[PDB]
Amino acid sequence: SRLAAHRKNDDNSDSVPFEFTPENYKEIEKILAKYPLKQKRSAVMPLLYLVQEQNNNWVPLSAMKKIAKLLEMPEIDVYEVATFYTMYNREPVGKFHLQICGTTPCQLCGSREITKAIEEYTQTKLGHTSADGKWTLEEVECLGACSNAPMIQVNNKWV
Amino acid sequence: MLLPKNAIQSARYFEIQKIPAKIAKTANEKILSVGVAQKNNIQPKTVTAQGQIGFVQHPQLDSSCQYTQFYTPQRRDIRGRVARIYIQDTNHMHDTPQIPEGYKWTLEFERQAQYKTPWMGWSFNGDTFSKRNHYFCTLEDAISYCKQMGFGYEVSFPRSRYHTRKSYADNMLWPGHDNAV
Amino acid sequence: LNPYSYEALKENHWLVSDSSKKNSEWTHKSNAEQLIAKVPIIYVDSNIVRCIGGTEINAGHPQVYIQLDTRKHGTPQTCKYCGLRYAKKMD
Amino acid sequence: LFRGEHALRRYPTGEERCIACKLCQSACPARAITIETEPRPDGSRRTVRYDIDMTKCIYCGFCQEACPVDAIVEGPNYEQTAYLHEDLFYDKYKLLENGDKWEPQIARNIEYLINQPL
Amino acid sequence: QKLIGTNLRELRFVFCQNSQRSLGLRNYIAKNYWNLKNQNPNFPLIVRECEEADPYIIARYQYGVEKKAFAANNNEAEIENIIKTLVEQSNKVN
Amino acid sequence: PLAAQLAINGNRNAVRYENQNRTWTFNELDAHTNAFAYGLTELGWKAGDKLLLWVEKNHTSEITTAQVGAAKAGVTLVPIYAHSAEELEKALNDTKAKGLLLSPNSKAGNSKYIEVVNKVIPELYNTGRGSTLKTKFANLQHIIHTGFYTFPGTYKFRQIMVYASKNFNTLTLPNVELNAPLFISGNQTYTLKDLISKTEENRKTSKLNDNTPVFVTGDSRSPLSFSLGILNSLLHGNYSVYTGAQDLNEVGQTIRFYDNALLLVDGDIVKATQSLKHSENFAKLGGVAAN
Amino acid sequence: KQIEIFIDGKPAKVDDSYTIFQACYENGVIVPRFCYHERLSVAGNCRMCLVEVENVPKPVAACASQVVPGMKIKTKSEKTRIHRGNVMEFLLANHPLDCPICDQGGECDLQDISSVYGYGISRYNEYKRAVEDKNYGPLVATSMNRCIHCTRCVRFATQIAGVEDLGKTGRGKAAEIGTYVEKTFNTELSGNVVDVCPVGALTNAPYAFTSRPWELKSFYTSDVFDTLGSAIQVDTRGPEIMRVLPRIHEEINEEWISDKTRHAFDGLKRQRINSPMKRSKDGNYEDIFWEEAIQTISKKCLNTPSDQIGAIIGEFADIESITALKDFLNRLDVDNFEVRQHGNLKVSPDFRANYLMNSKITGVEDADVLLLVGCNPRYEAPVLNARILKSTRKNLKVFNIGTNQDLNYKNVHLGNSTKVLKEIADGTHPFAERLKKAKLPMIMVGASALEREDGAELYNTLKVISNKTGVISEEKSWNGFNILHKEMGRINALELGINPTSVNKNAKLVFILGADNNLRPEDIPADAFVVYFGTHGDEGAYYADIILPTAAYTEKNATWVNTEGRVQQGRLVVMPPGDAREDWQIIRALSEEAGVPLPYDSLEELRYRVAELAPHLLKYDYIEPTIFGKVALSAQQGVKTTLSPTPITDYIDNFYMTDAISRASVTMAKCSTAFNHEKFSNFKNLAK
Amino acid sequence: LNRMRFITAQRDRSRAPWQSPKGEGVFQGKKLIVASNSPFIDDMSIR
Ligand code: SF4
Ligand code: SF4
Numbered sequence A: 001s002r003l004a005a006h007r008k009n010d011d012n013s014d015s016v017p018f019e020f021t022p023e024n025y026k027e028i029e030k031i032l033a034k035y036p037l038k039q040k041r042s043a044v045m046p047l048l049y050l051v052q053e054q055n056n057n058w059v060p061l062s063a064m065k066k067i068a069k070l071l072e073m074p075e076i077d078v079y080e081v082a083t084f085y086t087m088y089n090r091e092p093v094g095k096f097h098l099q100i101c102g103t104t105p106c107q108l109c110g111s112r113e114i115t116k117a118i119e120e121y122t123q124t125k126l127g128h129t130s131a132d133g134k135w136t137l138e139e140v141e142c143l144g145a146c147s148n149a150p151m152i153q154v155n156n157k158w159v
Numbered sequence B: 001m002l003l004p005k006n007a008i009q010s011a012r013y014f015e016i017q018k019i020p021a022k023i024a025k026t027a028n029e030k031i032l033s034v035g036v037a038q039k040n041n042i043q044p045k046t047v048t049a050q051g052q053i054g055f056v057q058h059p060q061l062d063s064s065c066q067y068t069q070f071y072t073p074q075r076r077d078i079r080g081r082v083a084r085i086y087i088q089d090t091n092h093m094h095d096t097p098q099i100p101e102g103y104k105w106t107l108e109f110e111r112q113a114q115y116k117t118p119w120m121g122w123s124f125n126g127d128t129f130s131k132r133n134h135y136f137c138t139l140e141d142a143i144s145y146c147k148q149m150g151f152g153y154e155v156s157f158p159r160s161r162y163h164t165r166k167s168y169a170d171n172m173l174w175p176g177h178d179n180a181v
Numbered sequence C: 001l002n003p004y005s006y007e008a009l010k011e012n013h014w015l016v017s018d019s020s021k022k023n024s025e026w027t028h029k030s031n032a033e034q035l036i037a038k039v040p041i042i043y044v045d046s047n048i049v050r051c052i053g054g055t056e057i058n059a060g061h062p063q064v065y066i067q068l069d070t071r072k073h074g075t076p077q078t079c080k081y082c083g084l085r086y087a088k089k090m091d
Numbered sequence D: 001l002f003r004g005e006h007a008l009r010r011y012p013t014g015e016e017r018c019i020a021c022k023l024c025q026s027a028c029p030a031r032a033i034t035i036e037t038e039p040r041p042d043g044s045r046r047t048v049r050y051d052i053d054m055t056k057c058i059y060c061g062f063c064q065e066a067c068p069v070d071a072i073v074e075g076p077n078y079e080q081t082a083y084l085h086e087d088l089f090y091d092k093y094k095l096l097e098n099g100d101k102w103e104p105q106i107a108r109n110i111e112y113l114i115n116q117p118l
Numbered sequence E: 001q002k003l004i005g006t007n008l009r010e011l012r013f014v015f016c017q018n019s020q021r022s023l024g025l026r027n028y029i030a031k032n033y034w035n036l037k038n039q040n041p042n043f044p045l046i047v048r049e050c051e052e053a054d055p056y057i058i059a060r061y062q063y064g065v066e067k068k069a070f071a072a073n074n075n076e077a078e079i080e081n082i083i084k085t086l087v088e089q090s091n092k093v094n
Numbered sequence F: 001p002l003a004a005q006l007a008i009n010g011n012r013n014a015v016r017y018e019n020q021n022r023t024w025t026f027n028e029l030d031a032h033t034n035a036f037a038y039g040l041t042e043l044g045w046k047a048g049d050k051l052l053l054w055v056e057k058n059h060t061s062e063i064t065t066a067q068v069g070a071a072k073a074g075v076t077l078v079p080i081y082a083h084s085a086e087e088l089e090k091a092l093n094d095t096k097a098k099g100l101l102l103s104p105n106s107k108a109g110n111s112k113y114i115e116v117v118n119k120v121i122p123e124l125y126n127t128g129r130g131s132t133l134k135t136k137f138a139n140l141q142h143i144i145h146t147g148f149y150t151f152p153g154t155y156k157f158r159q160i161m162v163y164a165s166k167n168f169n170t171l172t173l174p175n176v177e178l179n180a181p182l183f184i185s186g187n188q189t190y191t192l193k194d195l196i197s198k199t200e201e202n203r204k205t206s207k208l209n210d211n212t213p214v215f216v217t218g219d220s221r222s223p224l225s226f227s228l229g230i231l232n233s234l235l236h237g238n239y240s241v242y243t244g245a246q247d248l249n250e251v252g253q254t255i256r257f258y259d260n261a262l263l264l265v266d267g268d269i270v271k272a273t274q275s276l277k278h279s280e281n282f283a284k285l286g287g288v289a290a291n
Numbered sequence G: 001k002q003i004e005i006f007i008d009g010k011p012a013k014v015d016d017s018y019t020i021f022q023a024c025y026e027n028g029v030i031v032p033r034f035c036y037h038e039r040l041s042v043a044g045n046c047r048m049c050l051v052e053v054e055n056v057p058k059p060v061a062a063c064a065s066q067v068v069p070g071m072k073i074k075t076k077s078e079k080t081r082i083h084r085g086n087v088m089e090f091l092l093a094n095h096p097l098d099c100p101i102c103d104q105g106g107e108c109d110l111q112d113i114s115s116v117y118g119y120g121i122s123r124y125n126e127y128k129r130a131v132e133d134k135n136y137g138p139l140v141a142t143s144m145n146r147c148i149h150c151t152r153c154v155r156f157a158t159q160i161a162g163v164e165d166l167g168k169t170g171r172g173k174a175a176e177i178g179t180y181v182e183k184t185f186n187t188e189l190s191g192n193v194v195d196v197c198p199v200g201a202l203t204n205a206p207y208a209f210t211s212r213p214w215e216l217k218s219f220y221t222s223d224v225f226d227t228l229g230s231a232i233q234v235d236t237r238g239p240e241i242m243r244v245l246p247r248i249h250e251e252i253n254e255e256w257i258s259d260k261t262r263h264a265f266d267g268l269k270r271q272r273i274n275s276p277m278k279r280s281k282d283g284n285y286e287d288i289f290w291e292e293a294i295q296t297i298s299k300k301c302l303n304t305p306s307d308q309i310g311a312i313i314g315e316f317a318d319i320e321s322i323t324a325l326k327d328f329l330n331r332l333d334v335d336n337f338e339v340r341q342h343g344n345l346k347v348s349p350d351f352r353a354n355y356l357m358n359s360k361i362t363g364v365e366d367a368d369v370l371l372l373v374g375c376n377p378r379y380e381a382p383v384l385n386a387r388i389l390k391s392t393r394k395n396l397k398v399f400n401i402g403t404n405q406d407l408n409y410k411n412v413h414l415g416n417s418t419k420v421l422k423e424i425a426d427g428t429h430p431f432a433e434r435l436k437k438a439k440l441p442m443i444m445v446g447a448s449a450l451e452r453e454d455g456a457e458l459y460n461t462l463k464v465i466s467n468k469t470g471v472i473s474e475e476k477s478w479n480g481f482n483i484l485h486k487e488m489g490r491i492n493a494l495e496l497g498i499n500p501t502s503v504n505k506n507a508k509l510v511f512i513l514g515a516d517n518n519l520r521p522e523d524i525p526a527d528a529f530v531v532y533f534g535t536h537g538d539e540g541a542y543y544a545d546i547i548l549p550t551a552a553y554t555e556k557n558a559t560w561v562n563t564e565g566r567v568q569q570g571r572l573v574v575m576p577p578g579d580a581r582e583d584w585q586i587i588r589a590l591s592e593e594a595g596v597p598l599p600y601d602s603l604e605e606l607r608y609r610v611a612e613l614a615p616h617l618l619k620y621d622y623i624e625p626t627i628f629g630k631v632a633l634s635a636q637q638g639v640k641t642t643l644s645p646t647p648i649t650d651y652i653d654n655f656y657m658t659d660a661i662s663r664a665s666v667t668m669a670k671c672s673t674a675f676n677h678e679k680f681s682n683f684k685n686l687a688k
Numbered sequence H: 001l002n003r004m005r006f007i008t009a010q011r012d013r014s015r016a017p018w019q020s021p022k023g024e025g026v027f028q029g030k031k032l033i034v035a036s037n038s039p040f041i042d043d044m045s046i047r
């Protein structure tokens, strides 16, 4: 979620393989059934979520091309969707992707203190990933539960 | 660049619109007399901004070309030359020029020898007459100038975009029923 | 390293390269390419570098900005007005 | 502000300050500047031929005024008497040599000129 | 009609497609082009249509020699007679 | 026999071509192979007709498509390893092949394949456009080259290919017969049933499970390579990756991503490669097999 | 429905379908724009066309807003001025200071609009946006810092062409328009991307750093690299030519030109013959005078009996040159205008309908079904391919018999052999019923198919199929039979009436009028004497005992007839290089020296002779209708109609190398080496 | 004294004369065989 283009990485090359599991294929079939038969182009986001779940919480370029081929839509459309939506990690992340809310309510509640405490505990800076592939800090916008701030989210799943 | 229809109905205006039909004078023309007759019969009878068929008119070295000033002892090639009359539109590179074009008829002359001199590589033109194009408000004025100066003229009529219906709603269109075949 | 090879053309933006930099002495009547090639890559911590070609405004070229956050880490970028090449100090 | 002999300057690194924008050519009232440019092998936008006809040029200074990078500068040299007409067809070689020779005084004047607005 | 190939080198019909002055030659060609082509397989029989064009039958015999016949307001019989005369005059021409 | 994977799951990836960087799903592979078969049928290929294979390692996709199309159409394929015009002519005379698919840019000795073919059959140079071949062999009706340029008396692979229409296809594909010969390697002929049996035996010997991806290095024209590659993918739904002429270094670079992947290694590639720059890439090879 | 509106208090009437911008343009008031394009979709991103409406508080986007009855538009109001200034300030914010180095300095609509409407001074004093450059190939140079995110390039790529690579990737000020992955934009219409891009973000790489707009003189002419014909503008700074562009001609050009016609003019800059030459037996070429060359040629002609004299028609032969050559050969008694026996076009030049596209270039927009036979519109006439893409996206179905090329639009591949044609002719094929059901069907056949050895049989089969299926219908008043040619010289020869089938098997004196394609040593007898009228020495100049320089299409004032039968006038931009003379003048001088003077001494007299031969060629930029189409295309009884069992192929292998000029060009060589490997594929792109 | 180089370069910028064969050359029928002088490599033919 840093660059608006493909980062030149040896571990994210076109040669990297990716194949959906049969459970993922069944889920894709269910999603297509939910969506209109002709409008298969609307299933990009569920497919990206399934790819993230299958992989280590990131969407490989090969996986994106596979999604485009399955949906019979240009790969450029999938690229645009992934780049536009920030919840899709286009590069590998750590075991714990901490997402600290930094909007005005959390800032008033003391989000900066929580961020400093997290940095001190994890021995890493905001945004930067820890040396070991264990922690990845990020600053995000309003996650919704402002009345309960300060707040964080892990793996885009647990608040 | 377009006066109201039949706004001018003068004899001079009608003569300017009309083009003369050639008379075979040279030996080659007499030999090709049938070709001259065919060309006279086929070429458009009158020239108007609403025309659509291009044509080439031979120079009329007649008493009408008495107003030319480019027939001098030193230079005797300017008169009788063939020009091109067309509307120069804005380049495709840009759509809103600071100085828009296409509002006037351009008269152009084919350029003669153009050579780069050895001492400095600077460009030189064998003739200085065809360096700058001429501009006229109306094709009638351009043709009148050509007749007065004794220059022959090819005329190429302009082409413009065909008007098409434009609406932002066309971006969103319902493809149809899925079962449709 | 054939200058006309496809790889060389792609790397040099589809222009025939001159490794010796001597042909420019005649083509453009100057050794400025050779002179500028001596300057090494300037490493800048920030992702975006501002260049004015001098110490003060109006003493160089118009103020320009160059992105050092290349899609491939560490790739130098050359200023268009001057041949100075800047790269991010990856750490 | 004296306008003497046209010359071409360089950056302190030695790179040419002239980029082939042809603003000076367009502004030259006497059409005394001829510029032809081709991309350099390194990819720089540099001219391949930059000629000034000193006999056809009026020492107005529009070239230096229109130069956006202070590449062409009318330096203070005025003792440029020539015996052959061909010697007054200044070329890129001549302009670069003049700029190299007269850079100190030209730079000194440019310092004050730039500081005046401040 | 069978000797056109040997007698002539080319036949051409230049006329108008919407003029009564050409109507006769137009109809004759439209009716007899295939007949003449079958009679002479490889002979060149060119047809040219131009609005407000004077009808003309151009017979090229040999050595860059051509004869042009004005066929305006001529019935199909007159066109046949003119073509026959052009074909027969090949011996006199060469 | 060749549509079980399509019936089960056609969206799954079928084969990968690392050398030319193109991956085909089961549906795409079936479509291309059917197009090739329809093209041959339209040209007039019948059951038992002989097609000679003279395509180098790099054209892995062409080799695989030709093999599968020939299997579908009941056309026997004879690989030929000839570096000389004498050997090429001897093979042509012995086999009486109806077609000859080759790689023009490949170099044999001091001459290219196209040059050798022209030398063997000078009639191709002056052959008319759209004219049938009148050659000494009297049976080599079709000559096909996998090259960018075109030559007289030869047709390109894409030109030969014919993609059948859904409602405008008058061509017919004869039912694939298992006993019909498919490959003629040396003096031994392999049928489709024999190739399937070889696939099963190799899988059992190498513990090749369904989810284990297979890699093939070198020429794919070998019967063992065909068995353990595209045929294995079409039978058991496995995932095959062809590296073509890529050396061990690039093969390992590709292998890194794949886990517990079987590898088929060619002796020519082994001789060509000097040593493994990064042995860590093969730390999880799972199993290794040799042709 | 006509509706009355007011523009600056000026009454006007427009139909409801009009938008505010369209009404303003019709009434003559200009409105600035950056993203709106006439031929592209409607987008409201830039919002520079904002105007003031009395009853609308918010500014109204003129480009994407329809007129309303009683609307009071104030385009000269202070509020409109403020809106334009604000939008211009926002656009210029973050815009790099690259005007001196930007190749669009003189043709920058952004600069023009900022000078005319926007403010004169900026307030943004902060770090600007910086974007990495991208590599789109040797045809487009990219400077993304100058991009304004107007998406015009993306819309052109997705709509005008079938390539889908460009897109707006990212969100916010960090959004970047372009390919997410690093790949080249290698579409055949990549040149028009620069034209559509208004802020010099994408520029003409070959033309980069060359010149400026204000020092260029423009001439309108017609393209020759493609038999389709295109209305182009040639810009020159003295002798040098540069920046060939399209010009609006909707009937044939539709504002777009192909990369070949856009970047093949560089071939004229090198490998040019500039003096008459003679080759010795040892093979040492030596320059000679025109007088000596013409005298020796005339002596050879006089010595040689007319029986063993033949000619070859070149690719770029024009009406005047072909007429002069025909008259000279007729006066010498020579009637065979072909020497090559390997491949000859099998079509009779009697009727124009039987060797010209009966339906015009716009006939695809009207036909419901289009069947191609050995035709690759993407490689030949790419503009026609884009028109076919538009037609098939609106209403049209495309069928193909031959090679399955990567067309930008979906097509139904019936086959590649003559079996499909035989079945269709017999009527058993379902496509016969399909054509009968369809209204206004069209058949497009490439010239290679008719040039096949069985070209006559294939042509007769096409005639009978068309007659049976109604492609030539009197009730519909439709003639969908078409032939796509590959040689403008061949088209001109057919127009003048030269028979392509007349071939001299054994010729002692060969006149090659600038022919460089299909030449082989076997065609020329070892003992023959060859006179080659040409402009490039890549080919044909090595078979020539005498070589005579000639003029090119940019250097010759002549007439050209395109594939659809439209006759245009190619104008003189620069004089022929060196000692080159016009080919018709050379032929006239040769005739006079040989003793058979021609009856024309100038262009006017030569065009009178052209009128004698075929008067319709004197109506420039016009297609003369023919009423003998049915008679010409009628199927005869007893014809062979026997096809061969071989694939139908396409002659084009490398789109960037098809003629001598393209082969001699450097930009074309760069495009070839950069695109051939990426575009070559033995398989079909199943995605489209 | 080196004016020839400059003049030739200026002439070639707009029109470069074709370098015709000189001296004895190989002949194939009525055709002189000469190797192509194009610096660019024919990648498709080579591979
Ligand atoms: S002083 Fe004036 S006329 Fe002379 S070169 Fe400079 S701008 Fe041109
Ligand atoms: S001297 Fe200055 S104005 Fe003239 S081209 Fe060079 S940089 Fe541009």
Ligand code: SF4
Pocket: G095, G096, G097, G098, G099, G100, G102, G103, G104, G105, G106, G108, G110, G111, G146, G198, G199, G200, G201
């Ligand atoms: S596009 Fe930008 S840099 Fe180029 S001329 Fe226009 S404003 Fe200047």
Ligand code: SF4
Pocket: G146, G147, G148, G149, G150, G151, G152, G153, G154, G177, G196, G197, G198, G199, G201, G202
């Ligand atoms: S590259 Fe050009 S055309 Fe494309 S969005 Fe940017 S400014 Fe518009």
Ligand code: FES
Pocket: A101, A102, A103, A104, A105, A106, A141, A142, A143, A144, A145, A146, A149, A151
């Ligand atoms: S303020 Fe933290 S989730 Fe909204």
Ligand code: FES
Pocket: G032, G033, G034, G035, G036, G043, G044, G045, G046, G047, G048, G049, G050, G061, G062, G063, G064
């Ligand atoms: S032109 Fe109207 S918003 Fe761009």
Ligand SMILES: [Zn+2]
Pocket: C051, C052, C053, C061, C079, C080, C081, C082, C083, C084
């Ligand atoms: Zn700089």
